[PDB]
């Protein structure tokens, strides 16, 4: 057994310099004398810059670096379902080794222009506000952006849980979190049964910066394996800002000149390369899809920041969560004026498209009109009706944690709201009205639910109006 070998010059902070390795390859895996792996990033004239993918305490100057002959690769396969793994593919749950016989490059080209198909099928998150105002389709990438403690992780957990019956593999990537928080998330998923089809990749805060930098790429590489076999995959990047910070740390350690806020020049290219690999494949490519939900954390609600601006410029849409909305009682705290989906309409069931085609612009106009007319006297009856309708819609859109709602019931409640049947109901009672309306449909409106679930269009309005009137007669206003 023979291999090209080098010698170590410098060691420190997870960065190593090596002399030799003349035939080393750009991006090739290398291993040290103690078994710790590395990745070659800088190929200078006389030395190689290696980033250490593990504990660098046992590496000393003069040690030997050995080539592997392989581009950065991660294991893939069905054996990863239900497991929590390192970004390199090693399990960390203590349930034994994973039996994967296949691997994929961590850097691969995105599907081309002719390889894609327009997003045309919905992804049901189980949240009324998202499903109505900011639709998400399979193959779409939607950004979730907001301050800390606003529900960003809760939205992703609910979305992953809602895929229990729908045929979709879920991948949850956690970057820079506490292992206790990751374990809590895994326990919630196991409790709700989502762990039977979910892969979770963890890179905690104690891990070196390269693991945090490589975790999203490992996740998308694992997802692509199922995507190119015709399956549908959902990938969640729980924090892209921490990955960006880790990449900045690596770049500064490798003596690369800094730019704005000490970030490197290709901080935008990093995220663009990561996010362009999610797509809806054409029928000639298999028809599979991969949808991504990247996360961005703002500081005091500042959106003009570098990383938030860069990520917003890439994704197909963003969902805004605001602390003032969160504390005002409306949860989820989705800002209808700022949130938008570029694939809206095409990513909705026909009934939902009928009932909520205008609701987002309606809420934006209502928010504009509430600020105006606050100082005045709400004199005009038209303004006095618009405000009333807006209040009902806002109170209807509220939802509780871990309480998914089927799309057939969502379209029914949106129809009842938007057709004017809630105009004679006070604002304080519409939540209980909806709660009782769901039971009324479960007891007496099974045929409407079956019709919506089978044919994606609404039933005849006469029967629906009759059922709504019957429920209204039964209902009593408190």
């Amino acid at each position: 057994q023979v291999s090209d070998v080098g010698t170590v010059i410098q060691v420190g902070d997870g960065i190593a310099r090596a002399h030799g390795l003349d035939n080393v390859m750009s991006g090739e895996l290398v291993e040290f004398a103690n078994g710790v792996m590395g990745m070659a990033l800088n190929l200078e004239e006389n030395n190689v810059g290696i980033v250490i993918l593990g504990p660098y305490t046992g590496i000393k100057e003069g040690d030997e670096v050995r080539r592997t002959g392989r581009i950065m690769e991660v294991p893939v396969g069905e054996a990863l379902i239900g497991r929590v793994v390192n970004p390199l593919g090693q399990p960390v749950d203590g349930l034994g080794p994973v039996e994967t016989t296949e691997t994929r490059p961590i850097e691969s080209p995105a599907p081309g222009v002719m390889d894609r198909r327009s997003v045309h099928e919905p992804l049901q998150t189980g949240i009324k506000a998202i499903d109505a105002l900011v639709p998400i389709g399979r193959g779409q990438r939607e950004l979730i952006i907001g301050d800390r403690q606003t529900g960003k992780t809760s939205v992703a957990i609910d979305t992953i849980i809602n895929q229990k019956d729908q045929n979709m593999i879920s991948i949850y990537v956690a970057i820079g979190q506490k292992e206790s928080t990751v374990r809590t998330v895994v326990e919630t998923l196991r409790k709700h049964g989502a762990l039977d089809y979910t892969i979770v990749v963890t890179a905690s805060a104690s891990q070196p910066a390269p693991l945090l930098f490589l975790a999203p790429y490992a996740g998308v590489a694992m997802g692509e394996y199922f995507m190119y076999k015709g399956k549908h995959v959902l990938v969640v990047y729980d924090d892209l800002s921490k990955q960006a910070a880790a990449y900045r740390e690596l770049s500064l350690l490798l003596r690369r000149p800094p730019g704005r806020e000490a970030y490197p020049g290709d901080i935008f290219y990093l995220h663009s390369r990561l996010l362009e690999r999610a797509a809806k494949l054409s029928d000639a490519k298999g028809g599979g899809s991969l949808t991504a939900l990247p996360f961005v954390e703002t500081q005091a609600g500042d959106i003009s920041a570098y990383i938030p601006t860069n990520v917003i410029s890439i994704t197909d849409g963003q969902i805004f969560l605001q602390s003032d909305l969160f504390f005002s009682g409306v949860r989820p705290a989705i800002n209808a004026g700022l949130s938008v989906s570029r694939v809206g309409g095409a990513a909705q069931i026909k009934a939902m498209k009928k009932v909520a085609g205008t609701l987002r612009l309606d809420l934006a106009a209502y928010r504009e009109l509430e600020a105006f007319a606050q100082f005045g006297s709400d004199l005009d009856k038209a303004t006095q009706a618009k405000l009333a309708r807006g209040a009902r819609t806002v109170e209807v859109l509220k939802q509780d944690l871990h309480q998914p709602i089927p799309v057939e019931k969502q379209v029914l409640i949106i129809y009842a709201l938007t057709r004017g049947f809630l105009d004679d109901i006070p604002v304080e009672d519409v939540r209980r009205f909806e709660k009782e309306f769901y039971l009324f449909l479960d007891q007496n409106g099974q045929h409407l639910l079956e019709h919506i679930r089978t044919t994606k269009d609404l039933p005849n309005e006469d029967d629906l109006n009759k059922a709504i009137e019957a429920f209204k007669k039964t209902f009593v206003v408190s």
Binding site: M25, M114, G259, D266, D316, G337, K353, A365, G376
Partner: protein
């Protein structure tokens, strides 16, 4: 015959050493065509472009694709010329990458086809044309306040999510179907989803037989993003010069050219500029933009979408871009948050064509009156938000009353906006929109509710939509 070898690889920047007296010229293209000798290597087919001469027979280059797999000492071939792409009727109906290689799976271009170099000097002072003519677009705000010029340069400014892409698509739908000439689209640094959607829409509409498309997108390395615009530009220049055709040039996002140029300046070894941009920002932007002009042999009218980072119009890239345009459309997300689309700023938008002798005295006066009314309205909001409308005078109350209706009537429903609005689009002529705004200024429809003007088209549709509310 001469060859070089790779001596250093730093991300997208590669250094090549040549023999003495055989250095390649700047902007020349280089080829690496390594075949894997054994199982420890991978096959490589990569193109490089010469950028600097470092001395000691060493050349610094920028790669056009991913540099993964490169090994120090790989043999490099010099082609002796810059990047060359096919030109002519061959490009019509085809989709190309930055290198001029088709990506539509329709077949390869014959090797004997004519190919033109990517880089060339700009047209001279004598050969330029300056005659101004109105281009009708069918959009009310554009036709009223900032008319577009045939053969001129039009730029659309805006932040993220304000409607630049939708406006580009609507302009394509309104113009390219009836233009009669050739059109070229340059997908510089944007979404592959958007590119595929546009390609399929043009294929279904039949315009595809009259247009050529070149795409370099977000996933591409900086070199492709900073040379795809020049590829599309030379494809359009062939038609402008050799055949004298009228050419529509659409650029998906011209800010990505600047961003890609800035991503590699530090690796090229240049000291940073004010906001982290490259020192050669204005020089590169001018060298690119000055080639897009109308001459005596032919005319090119170009519509470009320009990204504004963080909604800051004082950013150096838009600030330098502003001076290169004849007509300017500004999109502000304040109008987008309020549900008004296309959300064109009625004041910041300017055009060289808004003159009494160019557009007409009545049109000029009605546009100026609309601008004056909106400017007066903008000042009243600050005191209204505190002291209420009740404290305003009778004149200012009427000013607000008419200004809100004017601002709401500035909205429109686009054909491509069906996915977002349900209702279909409309096409409003300039005479009709001028007449409608004149009526609203005169105050004929003060009794109508303000909501009746939202995304309506003409005032006839306003008064008909009012009937639905019982007014």
């Amino acid at each position: 015959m001469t060859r070089g070898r790779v001596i250093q690889v730093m991300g997208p920047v590669v250094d090549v050493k040549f023999e003495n007296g055989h250095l390649p010229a700047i902007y020349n293209a280089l080829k690496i065509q390594h075949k894997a000798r054994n199982e420890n290597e991978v096959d490589i087919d990569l193109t490089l472009e010469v950028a600097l001469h470092l001395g000691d027979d060493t050349v610094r280059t920028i790669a056009m694709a991913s540099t993964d797999g490169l090994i120090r000492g790989m043999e490099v071939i010099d082609t002796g010329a810059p990047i060359s792409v096919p030109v002519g009727e061959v490009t019509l109906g085809r989709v190309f990458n930055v290198l001029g290689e088709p990506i539509d799976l329709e077949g390869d271009i014959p090797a004997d086809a004519r190919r033109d170099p990517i880089h060339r000097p700009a047209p001279k002072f004598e050969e330029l044309a300056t005659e101004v003519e109105i281009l009708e677009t069918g959009i009310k705000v554009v036709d009223l306040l900032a008319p577009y010029i045939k053969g001129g340069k039009i730029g659309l400014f805006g932040g993220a999510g304000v409607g630049k892409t939708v406006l580009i698509q609507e302009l394509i739908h309104n113009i390219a179907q009836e233009h009669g000439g050739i059109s070229v689209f340059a997908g510089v640094g944007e979404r592959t989803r958007e590119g595929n959607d546009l390609y399929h829409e043009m294929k279904d509409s039949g315009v595809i037989s009259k247009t050529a498309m070149v795409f370099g997108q977000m996933n591409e390395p900086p070199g492709a993003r900073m040379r795809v615009a020049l590829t599309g530009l030379t494809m359009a220049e062939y038609f402008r010069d050799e055949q004298g055709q009228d050419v529509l040039l659409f650029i998906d996002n011209i800010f990505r050219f600047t961003q890609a140029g800035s991503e590699v300046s530090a690796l090229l070894g240049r000291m940073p500029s004010a906001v982290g941009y490259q020192p050669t920002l204005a020089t590169e932007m001018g060298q690119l933009q000055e080639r897009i002009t109308s001459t005596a042999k032919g005319s090119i009218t170009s519509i470009q979408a320009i990204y504004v980072p963080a909604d800051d119009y004082t950013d150096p890239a838009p600030a330098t871009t502003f001076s290169h345009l004849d007509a300017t459309t500004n999109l502000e997300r304040k109008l987008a948050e309020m549900g008004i689309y296309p959300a064109v700023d009625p004041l910041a938008s300017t055009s060289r064509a808004l003159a009494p002798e160019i557009v007409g005295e009545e049109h000029y006066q009605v546009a100026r009156k609309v601008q004056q009314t909106l400017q007066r309205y903008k000042e009243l909001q600050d005191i209204i938000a505190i002291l209420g409308m009740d404290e305003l005078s009778d004149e200012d109350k009427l000013v607000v009353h008419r200004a809100r209706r004017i601002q709401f009537f500035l909205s429109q429903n686009f054909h491509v906006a069906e996915q977002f609005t349900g209702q279909p689009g409309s096409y409003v002529p300039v005479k009709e929109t001028v007449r409608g705004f004149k009526e609203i200024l005169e105050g004929k429809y003060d009794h109508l509710p303000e909501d009746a003007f939202r995304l309506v088209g003409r005032i006839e549709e306003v008064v008909e939509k009012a009937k639905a509310m019982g007014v």
